[PDB]
Amino acid sequence: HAPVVAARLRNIWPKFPKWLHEAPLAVAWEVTRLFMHCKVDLEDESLGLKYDPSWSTARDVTDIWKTLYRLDAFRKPFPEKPPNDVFVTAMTGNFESKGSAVVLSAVLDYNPDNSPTAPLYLVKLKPLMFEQGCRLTRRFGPDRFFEILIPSPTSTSPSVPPVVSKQPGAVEEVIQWLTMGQHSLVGRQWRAFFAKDAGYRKPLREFKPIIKERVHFFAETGITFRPDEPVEQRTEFKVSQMLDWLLQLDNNTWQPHLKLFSRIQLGLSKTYAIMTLEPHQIRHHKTDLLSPSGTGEVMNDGVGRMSRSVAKRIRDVLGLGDVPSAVQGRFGSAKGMWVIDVDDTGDEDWIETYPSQRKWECDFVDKHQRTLEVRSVASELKSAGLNLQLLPVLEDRARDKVKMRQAIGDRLINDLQRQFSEQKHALNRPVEFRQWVYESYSSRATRVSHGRVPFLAGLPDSQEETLNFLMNSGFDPKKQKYLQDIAWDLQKRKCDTLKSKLNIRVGRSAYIYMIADFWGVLEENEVHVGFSSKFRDEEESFTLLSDCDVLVARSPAHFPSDIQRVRAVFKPELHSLKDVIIFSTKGDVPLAKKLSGGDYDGDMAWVCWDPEIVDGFVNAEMPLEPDLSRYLKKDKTTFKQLMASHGTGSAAKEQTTYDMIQKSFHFALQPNFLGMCTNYKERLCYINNSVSNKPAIILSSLVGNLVDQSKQGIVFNEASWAQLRRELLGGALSLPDPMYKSDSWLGRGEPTHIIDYLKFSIARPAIDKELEAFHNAMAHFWDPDLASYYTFFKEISDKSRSSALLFTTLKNRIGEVEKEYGRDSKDPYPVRVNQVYEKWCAITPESKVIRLLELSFLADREMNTWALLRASTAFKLYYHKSPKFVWQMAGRQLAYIKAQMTSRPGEGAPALMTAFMYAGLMPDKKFTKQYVARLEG
Amino acid sequence: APVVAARLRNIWPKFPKWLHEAPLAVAWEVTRLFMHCKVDLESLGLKYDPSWSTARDVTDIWKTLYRLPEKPPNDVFVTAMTGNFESKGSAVVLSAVLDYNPDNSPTAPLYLVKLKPLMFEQGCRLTRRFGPDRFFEILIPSPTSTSPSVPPVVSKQPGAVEEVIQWLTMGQHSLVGRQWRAFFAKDAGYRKPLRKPIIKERVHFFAETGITFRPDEPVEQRTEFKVSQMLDWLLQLDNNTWQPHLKLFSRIQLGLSKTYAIMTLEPHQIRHHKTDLLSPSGTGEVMNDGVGRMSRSVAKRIRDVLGLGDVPSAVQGRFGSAKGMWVIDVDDTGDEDWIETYPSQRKWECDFVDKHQRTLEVRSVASELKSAGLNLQLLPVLEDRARDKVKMRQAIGDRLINDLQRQFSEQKHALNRPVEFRQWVYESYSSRATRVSHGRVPFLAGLPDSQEETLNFLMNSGFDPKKQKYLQDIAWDLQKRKCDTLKSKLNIRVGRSAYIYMIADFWGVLEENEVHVGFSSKFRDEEESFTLLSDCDVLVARSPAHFPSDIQRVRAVFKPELHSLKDVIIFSTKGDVPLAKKLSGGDYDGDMAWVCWDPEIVDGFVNAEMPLEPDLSRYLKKDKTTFKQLMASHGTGSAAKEQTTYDMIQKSFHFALQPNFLGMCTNYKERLCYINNSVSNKPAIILSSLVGNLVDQSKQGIVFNEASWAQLRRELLGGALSLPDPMYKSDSWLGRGEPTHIIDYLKFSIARPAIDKELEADGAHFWDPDLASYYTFFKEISDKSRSSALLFTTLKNRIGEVEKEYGRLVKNKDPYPVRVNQVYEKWCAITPKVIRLLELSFLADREMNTWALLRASTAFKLYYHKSPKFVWQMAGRQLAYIKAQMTSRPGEGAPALMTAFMYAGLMPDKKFTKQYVARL
DNA sequence: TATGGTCGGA
DNA sequence: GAACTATGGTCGGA
RNA sequence: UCCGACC
RNA sequence: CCGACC
């Protein structure tokens, strides 16, 4: 099997030395990383090579790393450190805390070295990380799982090494390497059980974009493992057994093994475990809800009911504010949505499953097969916008195409004019701008994560937070240009997103989980939408929808019928179901199926009730799709059929399960064409300006089949794609990229395409006009306050020569740091900033005056008086010459100086808030409008 | 009463010739200053300053008067000088307060006058039509007052009352160069005299003529106009002479109601209905009293004019003679302005021709609903109609116990962590009002004046309530205060309850016992949240509630036909009698119903039919005399009509001044119905009718005096006996045996013990080594340097002096804030190269220099054991700075020095506290 | 040259 | 009179 | 940016 | 404490 590649695959993984054998897995994982990052061989015998008993009882990785850095070889900057909370859990928490599992992850990139006896792939072990748990991690232990991002062996990229590219069997060798046998790492033997497309990933600069694949490995055996439950005291278990426990293969040999394999993802879905129902509490339905017109169509695909008590515990376990009307989760073999039974008057727990939910035949015996696992809940809704895919369909199903082009166009101009007229007004008053910046972006996540506002050097990392921080210390956005420049860039970027993606905001629109009406109250083509709270659009708001038409759609939208106009009817029967949209269970075909072959197992619909967009819309009847069986080759080989090659009984089953793995790995590594065929359709439809003619329809079918590839077992290669383009699509093979893909109009004449018209005839003009009005509406870097300490020390320096020397050294040192500030490198923008900052913080007084300036009793010397003087000098010397340097390095001190300077006797008191307490305060809107009222009179 | 009259000859300040040419505003402000400084306005070189006419700040006018007070806001003066007294719908108000003159000397004014500053109130129809400058309002002590304070001159001589009324009504009163005639008077309630409480009456005056007025339009350019004509403009007396003149008098308030003018509808756009909606059962009962429909476009304008966030579903306002509520027509498919009026709304026959009688005037809009509670009037009625009285008691009591425990448990858990306690303190009280008013957190000395803010200020700088005793003691004091408030007042709060505007079903969708409630946003109870009410029984009631039928149980049905109507409750127009009438005789002109959907409170309720009310005609006599009858005395024609109108004013002023018995008769019913423990027996129903009629006194012309009250008690009640206060009116159970009345039981058997139990129920210390950082820092320097040591010693001694002063003024005892400030001034007095570093002159605020920190540090070090409250009240500010500095760790974030204003505008983020508390 | 969309960053 | 004796509720300002 | 689920 | 409202 291509022996050239096989040799370079002998030792890709780092070796585990005997000295590290008696180590906690976390310690083993972390220690190995530093060695790799420091170039030191783990088996190097020059070093002492003795285990430090002190490592077995640690809480910060820095302590473990420091003991090694004492050795000369390690003594380079430290690599990213596992957060202490994660580290403690790995050693003392059994890898699980609050439903979160520590994850062992790696990124593998091809070795630049082309030496024949050299590792084919260079390995980077990622720091221990906390991630949501899943069924398999909860059942067999989060430490028994290892995931990697490996470059796809079938990548047609120039950057691919030649050993693999030239060798014909190269693909088979790597695939065999992954699946044939165990892989050794940190004292554990890992076996592959699953693989999925990770998409195009940028090769790590530590070692041109290449498609990478995520492979999942289970720890079958380890040195600490025992033959036939804590982490370091687990029992051997073969992947063939784990998959059997998950899928119950005995009762599922009739499934196509490729599809069987794809259901392993259901054991890996990130979920919160809620509760374990008893067998007598579970209602397994034998038949799905069926069309009342005898078409046989299923009307409740993927959705079933759940008791009110089950919903209540969902709220209690997840700490929700209210009881969720519906949740997305997994239950044994069931995957889909569950909705509260509006008819439940009791307090008994019960949940039902339906055929369309149950993806394999399951017995629901083990506790873990009867635990309701929640992946998400129906929450408060946001306003949504449009996307490039709805636009042609909206234009194609319009009674008047011209009226639509104007309607959507007007939405764009008036949304932009609001966005700017609001920011321009706020910029006049600092309190109003602070409110706007918090309303623009929310950093609550990073604030909770760090327990403080994250700060890069001397200013907050986020530009939004930087603005608020400096304004909170007294800076006026229209008086200091540093703040203006930040608001300018932020506005330009938000406009650039509108230019590059045309996300035209529609206030009367949202994405809502789709649910079917179990109770037959909604007639065909009626939907029910009730909100949990007031849904606001400009000067109109809603708690429900009634007596009006709505537009529903799903992405991707390709067929003319992928958008559908229906009638919003509020049924008081359903009133308690909030933040979900309920399709009727009457009619020939479920409405969800009409939305791009959608269902009710987690699907979210685009819901739009904007009249100017809805009433021009006319429905299209679902299209008659072409037979593409000649090109789309389906592999329906069953598990049973695979087993016949080997026999019957345990060993035969066990062999067949490993066949399923490697066979599915091969099918999972086939080059994907969903991207190409989708982009081809965009170009062809654009050139013909048609999303409804014959070629447009077939391509919509092709992309509709390709997206379901891994679950339908569809083989599709370059050859078939070129064949389909010749036989059915008119022989054109390479089509021109559309004009909207470019940032400026490179077309001839007035734009003809709706996207081109909106991007170049409506958006870019309006963007440029509003930006100039915003510039015209708006300042000086200089601020006499920020130089108070300079003037104060110069005066002392003039009177005293002793102080003069310190001033000169400080000034000269600052210039050196500015020189360093003055380019892309392996070390990124943050690391470069920190290095310049470290020299900046290095400037130090280096005696009564020195003590008064250094204030060494303060632990954080960035809070002493010397820091205030150093920043003041820097501002005076480089406010104009280099503004970014004086601020990114001295902003926090300059803010302190401003708040000191702006304080007036008697008029209140400034407040030095702790980082943490500051990071937990939000602007009070009600305070803002009342204060502005007091100013108007 | 000759003695009273001689004292009534010269009540008002005199208008000298030198101020004749002065603008009204200037004259009023000058008069106020001279009175405040006690200077006669009628031989010094007091001469007109032409600078005053062009003035834009009253202080500039006042500055010119330096030859030897509260100030109108500058925007008001400008609107008064150059804005025609009207700005943005606000009208500048000429207000005065009168009080009995202390001196009893005869030939001296009976009343002492104080002109209040010029001020903004919302305008009304009358000010918008004839001009705010022509309106003057006074709070005067009632002549029919039995108070001991009433001066003997009035009390001892009867007939003084008639004289005081004659002074007010007979003719004009000269003030600031204008002739003022009384036109209206209403009860202002008991009001404390400015330097013992007495009942005062609001009297309204209109300027008929003046020095600047023209015989038959800027402020100084008015035209003569008699009150008899203004009222005739408002009420169209020619077409309303059929009305009882007292009721007609009562309608003058409609012209004085503070309202926001929205739009002026044209005559074609007005739909006057000749008949009200009536019962489908033939009773003849009105089912839409006070309520009509309006177009969606008129509603959208109300949002635009009032700056509302959404279109209101219903408004309370006045349109010509129409008073009441208007609701959006859910069936309005058009875009044309239209409004409708019904007989019940129209309190007089108006022609709807003048624009001011065709303007829609809004007082209030249906708005976001707030959770309510059970007032003490509802509890007896709930028990009277309870299927099982013992289960009602059990529920309301068990609910109360659960609520108290939840609150106490929340406070205790919060203290454990500073971020959580900050959230509880903010939830406890809101300082937004003080913050917006001062643009900062108000500070007394070195710490915020409010204890609640002081805790947040010091926790925001790193202090821990569990680790610093100063924070601990403040929190304990605050908790005790809340517990003491809870013991005094029994406030049972029910989350699933709210007061909501009552509307009627024009569209005939609701049945007799069905109501519809949709909310504008999520109504949150701790357990659940609602956007609407469906498939549950609710209780509806109105305050006052006295009769057993005054609370009713209905079925909440959500009708998609009414879905657009939000923040309102809609009653049925079907049935014999309207539901609103059952709630203390309620209507839909702005009545708000108490709505409860709490199943525990609702489930036991059994509805009672409306009672047959006794005939109290013997004690309650109504004056139904009509305007015509009044006119028949004077004849026919304009002149007769003119003095009939002035007669109505004088007769009504007397009626309006009749001592009111609503308070006492209500208090008596409470005391008697408590002794009887019955709100449904003979006397309770008697007293409910009595108070049910007394509230409608002014509109029904009911005469009721001590004599009638004495004989009503004598015959129908237990007369002449002074009824005691119920036990629950006291803070403790001074009664015999275990309490039995529902209120005594809930306050004394349920609330008191639970509150007391929490009150009965390594650690906190004054010391904090971080706070002595600067002191220890300067002792090291002082040990190796003399000059500094002398500075340190002098400073250390100087704080000693201030500490002694704090004992002299703040330890025990002109007012307390002044004393604290006096020490603070002495404290900030303590002040000094090295001196230049310690005292940063470039800082205007010396409290921000390094010296302020050292002085705070040594003061803490030297007196944290002995004088804690001194150290903090003077230096808490700097101690918080020091704490924030010391707690900062290299790389663990950056502290933020916030300004006072930007600090005062920030708020605890509930989402942060909850998320951070999770993950420890 | 190889898709769109919804969420989160335990 | 020494002593009798002044309502509930909804919302806003200061 | 990047990382991670989901349809 | 001041102001409308039922």
Ligand SMILES: Nc1ncnc2c1ncn2[C@@H]1O[C@H](COP(=O)(O)NP(=O)(O)OP(=O)(O)O)[C@@H](O)[C@H]1O
């Ligand atoms: N990567 C993707 N890009 C675009 N669309 C996607 C993608 N993944 C899923 N979808 C959409 O989600 C649909 C898949 O539906 P499901 O996720 O429900 N899978 P389904 O075929 O129904 O099989 P089951 O698991 O339910 O037995 C596709 O047809 C697409 O519409």
Ligand SMILES: Nc1ncnc2c1ncn2[C@@H]1O[C@H](COP(=O)(O)NP(=O)(O)OP(=O)(O)O)[C@@H](O)[C@H]1O
């Ligand atoms: N000061 C008050 N104290 C107690 N209850 C009051 C008070 N003012 C009004 N009310 C209540 O509101 C009712 C008055 O209703 P209205 O204000 O509707 N007057 P009404 O007699 O109907 O005459 P119209 O002007 O509507 O023709 C009283 O019966 C009480 O229930």
Ligand SMILES: [Ca+2]
């Ligand atoms: Ca599908």
Ligand SMILES: [Ca+2]
């Ligand atoms: Ca689906």
Ligand SMILES: [Ca+2]
């Ligand atoms: Ca599905």
Ligand SMILES: [Ca+2]
């Ligand atoms: Ca009323």
Ligand SMILES: [Ca+2]
């Ligand atoms: Ca009424």
Ligand SMILES: [Ca+2]
């Ligand atoms: Ca994607």
Ligand SMILES: [Ca+2]
């Ligand atoms: Ca009152």
Ligand SMILES: [Mg+2]
């Ligand atoms: Mg009534």
